[PDB]
């Protein structure tokens, strides 16, 4: 028998002006999955249904967790329950974001964002598409692992100060470390229009190579390391 | 709707809303290049208050340094005093040295793995302790 | 009802749901100057299609050489002729095509030393129909092709004039005299009434493999769309055809690729013997769903499982050179571990057969419209389209072929925006509606919504979900499926007796599981009942007390010197299912397959035989 | 469009090496010359780096006008200083020397 006790920020929109107040419960984990969620679920369905998070794939493919755990930004499908009975986890909203309900955050900006890099290939001559597979040396392609495999689970930019003081004009790391993945895609011909996008003070240069993103992402990706990669671009491109 | 539209309409809708803005500084769990960071910004604030307070007071303040080193030798201060005095000064700069050598090896998009940058923290940290040392000794 | 704000919209076109068939139906239709709505109750990125991770079927002719015609016979034989072969021959055709645009999309599939799209081995693909051995046509991006997938298409939609209403509860269709007029739904983040009216509406919701207690699939697989397609009492075909994915993790129920096995993967049990080798001698581990999930499951019945409670198998990796595992399966490599503790360079992973997909869902044409069934034949239902997992067009039959989903949705997606772009014009007189329509749902949700029942949504849905699972698995027999439709038939009349406790208009996840609930109850109702009826063993269904294939005829032996059944004493049939909404009563009926291809001459007829590997 | 942003990080990156540079230097080679180009580098780069820490916490288009006009004061007069104290005075190098054996 062992009890573990959840510290789990709380907030209805829709209480006459509630204010937001950790809640806590307690999980009897022999009758628990390893994971943060598995226990998420469980007080869904035994103890408070009005309970209110974001959960899809529970393998950590979908991005839906991602959610404040003892201070560090990861899925909550993915994280492991801390067996110290000692220990009350506590379990936030991702930070600096608008909390519509509980843990759920207001990625609608987050999204707006990724849209305004225009993040799929783009060719001077499309009059061929669809018709011959392009082609694409295996070294070509080595420069793209550890960038494709983002989520978009958004651990990483509401993890980083600059995007807490400055996310409406600065993109943050999740965002530029996709607009890097098809800046080195071989198959796309607008690298220098893609460059010459991030020429104002906030898009790219808020950056201040804090380093939270890489530090945070629940799928190991380093999108601080691609956020200097754009830099050396930036100043080194012609035209 | 535009990336743009999209962004004003969610300003627009979430500043005329009472929904609270989730907690960040007061929850996020801090780590050593984290802190070394706004150490970077303090650090570097300190030392241009330094600066400025020095040029500043070159404009406006009668007397030469000469006059303002004696005016100083005045309640001398103990061996043990004028060293701390003289440490507190070296520290917030070869901090900052150090650390600004990590940014620009980091500009150059070197050592920028976390492993890395446990093993950067650390030795920034101590040849900031042995040159801060070393120089109020001078 | 009269308190809920319920808000009107005119648009060409929607589309509801944005996973892979989702997203290429929406762009489709917009790419073609249609004014498209789509609706998802996730962010399209979240959908199940994300989870891909085997690849993508084509016969680009990469590896080896190779003839989408032999695509085409591996799928029907596959399908152990339930598939309608007008599709098949459409699909396997449009294959070389779809791929093809996915990798001009962007899509980052692992590449060849003559930078061409790297594909691999699969279950059960062959070249020279059935002769020329193992075929490598699978396309992928390494290990996360479905992910990669999605995101290329949700990059693409970006381009568009779409408009999507994300987390938007899709609760039933509107519609108009046997007319499909729109849809309304439910705008999770305020909790208001949408009522969105369009001239033509695609249904691509994905499977509801979360009828079972143990599935590969997404908390939010649901079968939303045929429940909505029940609820307007149209037909579902099919449903008791449920996909055993024979390699899923013995804990949470992750999937472990196939494409573990098609890189040279091993199946092991407790004595340690290739028991794929003396089970299916000639396809050995890379063999059919059924009959390798057939076999394991088998194989546990015997004792010779491995584990603590005795309840699974061991998928060995090992062997393979551990480089080679880096570059083709490094996304189950994190699942393995993460969700096993298992290093795959060194041990094997704990797999058991749990439910994976839908092949069932709403009848289609090979166009995508959805059919209705009058007078022993088929019926377009106006104005109405079905795509992807949710959809049967049957180009899967009894049993799907491995990587022939992501397929499936690009293909008819695009068949979807197509079958429109011929059949009408943007803006062409988009169809009125009553005042009072779609009253049903906003009445049912308010129901709901302050439930004070006696059960949780949570309990009952854990009854469906162990029901299912202990009396419509691998293997079926009519006492067991009897006590198990009563049983489900039960639990339906305990929808009265429900409680919920969140009674908030934004983001009420309570409310909304419940709706789920509703929707996977009309799902595994049809499902159960179909499954009791069927008394054959073809494709994924295999009953213990009818083991054989009832056919038309008995094509072991020659078929001439014989008479043909007639239509209602074969079972070579398409299962048609219905139910009464408020009795929960299941009526049902039948169909026929096609066996006519688009052309004789270019793609023959694969007449029936003895399916086996 | 030009590609002002990326020049002025450059810039930064110049200025803060050629300041790295300049400090042993300055004690190898005390002199008048390193007086000033220390003067020039510190109050630039020093100036540059305020810049950063303005635009990044005031938010307003009021406040983020003013806070840069002031800074910019704030740097000129920190400038002629140093060049009135290197001209009219011991000299920065000297002034350290100066301070240090004490
Ligand atoms: C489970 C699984 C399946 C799978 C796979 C791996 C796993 C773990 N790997 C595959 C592979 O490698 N190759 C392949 O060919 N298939 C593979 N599969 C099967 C396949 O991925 C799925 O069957 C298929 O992707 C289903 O996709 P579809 O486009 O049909 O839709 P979806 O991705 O499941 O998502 C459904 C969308 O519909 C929306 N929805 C649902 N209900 C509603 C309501 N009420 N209102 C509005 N929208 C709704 C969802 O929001 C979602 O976007
Ligand atoms: C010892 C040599 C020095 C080097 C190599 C150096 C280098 C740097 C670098 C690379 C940064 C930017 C780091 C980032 O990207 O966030 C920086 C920040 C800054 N520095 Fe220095 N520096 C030095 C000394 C000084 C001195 C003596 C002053 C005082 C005038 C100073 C004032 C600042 C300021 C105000 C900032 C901005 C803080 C921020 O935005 O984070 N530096 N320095
Ligand atoms: O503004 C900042 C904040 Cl809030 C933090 Cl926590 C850090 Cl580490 C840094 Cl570097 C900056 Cl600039
Ligand atoms: O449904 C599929 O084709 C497959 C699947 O689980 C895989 O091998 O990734
Ligand atoms: S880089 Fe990592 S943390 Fe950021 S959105 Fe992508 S997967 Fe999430
Ligand atoms: S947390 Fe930050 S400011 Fe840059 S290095 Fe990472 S985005
Ligand atoms: S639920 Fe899909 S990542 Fe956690």
């Known amino acids: 028998p062992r009890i573990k006790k959840f510290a789990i920020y709380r907030w209805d929109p829709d209480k006459t002006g509630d204010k937001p107040h950790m809640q806590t419960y307690e999980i009897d984990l022999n009758n628990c999955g390893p994971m943060v969620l598995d226990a998420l679920i469980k007080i869904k369905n035994e103890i408070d249904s009005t309970l209110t998070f974001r959960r899809s794939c529970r393998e950590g493919i979908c991005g839906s967790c991602a959610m404040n755990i003892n201070g560090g930004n990861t899925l909550a499908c993915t994280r492991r329950i801390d067996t110290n009975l000692d220990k009350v986890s506590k379990i936030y909203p991702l930070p600096h974001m608008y909390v519509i309900k509980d843990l759920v955050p207001d990625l609608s900006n987050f999204y707006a964002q990724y849209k305004s890099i225009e993040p799929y290939l783009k060719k001077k001559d499309e009059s061929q598409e669809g ?40 993109l943050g790391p999740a965002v530029l470390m996709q607009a890097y993945r098809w800046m080195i895609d071989s198959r796309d011909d607008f690298t220098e229009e893609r460059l010459a996008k991030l020429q104002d003070p906030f898009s790219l240069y808020r950056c201040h190579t804090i380093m939270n993103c890489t530090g945070t992402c629940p799928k190991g990706l380093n999108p601080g390391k691609a956020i200097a990669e754009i830099k050396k671009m930036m100043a080194t491109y012609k035209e | 709707t535009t990336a743009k539209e999209e962004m004003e309409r969610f300003w627009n809708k979430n500043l005329g809303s009472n929904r609270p803005l989730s907690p960040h500084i007061t929850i996020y769990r801090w780590s050593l290049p984290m802190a070394m960071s706004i150490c970077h910004r303090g650090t570097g604030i300190a030392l241009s208050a330094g600066v400025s307070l020095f040029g500043l007071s070159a404009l406006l303040l009668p007397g030469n340094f000469e006059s303002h080193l004696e005016l100083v030798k005045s309640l001398c201060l103990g061996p043990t005093l004028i060293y701390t005095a003289k440490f507190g000064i070296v520290f917030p700069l070869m901090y900052h040295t150090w650390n600004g050598i990590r940014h620009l090896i980091w500009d150059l998009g070197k050592g920028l793995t976390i492993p890395q940058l446990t093993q950067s923290g650390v030795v920034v940290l101590i040849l900031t302790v042995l040159s801060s040392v070393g120089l109020a000794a001078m | ?261 098609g890189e040279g993967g091993i199946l092991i049990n407790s004595q340690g013997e290739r028991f794929m080798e003396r089970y299916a ?26 584990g603590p409670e005795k309840d699974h198998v061991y998928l060995q990796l090992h062997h393979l050179p551990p480089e080679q595992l880096a570059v083709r399966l490094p996304g189950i490599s994190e699942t ?55 959809a049967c067009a049957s180009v899967h039959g009894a049993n799907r072929l491995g990587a022939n989903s992501l397929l499936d949705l690009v293909v008819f997606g695009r068949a979807c925006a197509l079958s429109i772009a011929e059949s009408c014009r943007p803006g062409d007189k988009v169809p009125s509606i009553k005042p009072n329509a779609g009253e049903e749902s906003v009445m049912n949700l308010d129901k709901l919504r302050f439930a004070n029942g006696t059960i949780r949504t949570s309990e009952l849905r854990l009854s469906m979900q162990k029901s299912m699972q202990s009396h419509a698995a691998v293997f079926r027999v009519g006492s067991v499926l009897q006590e198990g439709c009563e049983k489900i038939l039960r639990l339906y009349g305990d929808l009265q007796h429900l409680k919920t406790f969140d009674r908030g208009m934004v983001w009420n996840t309570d409310l909304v599981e419940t709706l789920e609930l509703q929707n996977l109850m009309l799902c595994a109702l049809q499902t159960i009942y179909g499954a009791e009826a069927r008394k054959e063993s073809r494709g994924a269904h295999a009953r213990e007390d009818f083991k054989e294939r009832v056919d038309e005829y008995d094509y072991s032996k020659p078929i001439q010197g014989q008479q043909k059944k007639p239509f209602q004493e074969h079972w070579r049939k398409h299962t048609l299912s219905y139910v009464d909404v408020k009795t929960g009563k299941v009526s049902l009926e039948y169909r026929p397959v096609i066996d006519k291809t688009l052309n004789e001459a270019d793609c023959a007829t694969v007449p029936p035989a003895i399916r086996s590997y | 469009s030009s590609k002002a942003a990326s020049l002025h990080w450059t810039g930064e990156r110049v200025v803060s090496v050629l300041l790295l540079g300049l400090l042993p230097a300055a004690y190898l080679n005390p002199c008048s010359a390193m007086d000033y180009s220390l003067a020039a580098a510190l109050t630039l780069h020093g100036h540059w780096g305020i810049g950063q820490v303005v635009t990044d916490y005031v938010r307003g288009d009021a406040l983020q006008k003013a806070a840069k006009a002031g800074l910019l004061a704030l740097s000129a007069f920190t400038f002629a200083g140093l060049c009135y104290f290197n001209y009219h005075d011991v000299g920065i190098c000297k002034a350290v020397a100066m301070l240090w054996k004490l």
């Open chain 1, 131 to 170: 018709k011959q597979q392009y082609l694409q040396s295996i070294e070509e392609r080595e420069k793209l692992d550890g960038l494709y495999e983002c989520i978009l689970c958004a651990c990483c930019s509401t993890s980083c100060p600059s995007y807490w003081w400055n996310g409406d004009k600065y």
């Open chain 3, 1 to 261: 009802s009269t308190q809920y704000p319920v808000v009107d919209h005119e648009f060409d076109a929607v589309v509801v749901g944005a996973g892979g068939a989702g997203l290429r139906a929406a762009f489709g239709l917009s790419e073609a100057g249609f004014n498209t709505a789509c609706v998802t109750k996730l962010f399209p990125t979240r959908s199940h299609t994300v989870a891909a991770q085997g690849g993508i079927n084509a016969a680009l002719g990469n590896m080896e050489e190779d003839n989408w015609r032999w695509h085409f016979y591996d799928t029907v034989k596959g399908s152990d002729w339930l598939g309608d072969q007008d599709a098949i021959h459409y699909m396997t055709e449009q294959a070389p095509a779809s791929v093809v645009e996915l990798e001009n999309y962007g899509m980052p599939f692992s590449r060849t030393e003559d930078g061409k799209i790297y594909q691999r081995a699969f279950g059960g693909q062959s070249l020279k129909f059935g002769k020329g051995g193992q075929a490598h046509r699978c396309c992928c991006v390494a290990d996360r092709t479905g992910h990669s997938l999605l995101h290329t298409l949700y990059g693409r939609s970006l381009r568009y004039d779409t408009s999507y209403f994300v987390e938007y509860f899709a609760l039933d269709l509107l519609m108009e005299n046997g007319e499909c007029r729109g849809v309304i739904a439910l705008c999770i983040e305020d909790g208001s009434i949408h009522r969105i009216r369009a001239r033509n509406t695609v249904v691509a919701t994905g499977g509801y493999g979360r009828t079972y207690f143990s599935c590969t699939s997404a908390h939010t697989s649901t079968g939303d769309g045929t429940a909505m397609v029940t609820r307007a009492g149209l037909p579902c075909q099919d449903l008791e055809f449920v996909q055993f994915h024979p390699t899923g993790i013995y804990g949470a129920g992750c999937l472990i690729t196939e494409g573990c096995r």
């Open chain 3, 281 to 306: 001698p000639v396809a050995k581990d890379l063999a059919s769903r059924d009959v390798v999930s057939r076999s394991m499951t088998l194989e546990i019945r015997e004792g010779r499982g491995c």
């Open chain 3, 336 to 390: 393995a571990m993460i969700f096993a503790g298992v290093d795959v360079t060194k041990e094997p992973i704990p797999v058991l057969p749990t439910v994976h997909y839908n092949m069932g869902g709403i009848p289609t044409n090979y166009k995508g419209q959805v059919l209705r069934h009058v007078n022993g034949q088929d019926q377009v239902v106006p104005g109405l389209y079905a795509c992807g997992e949710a």
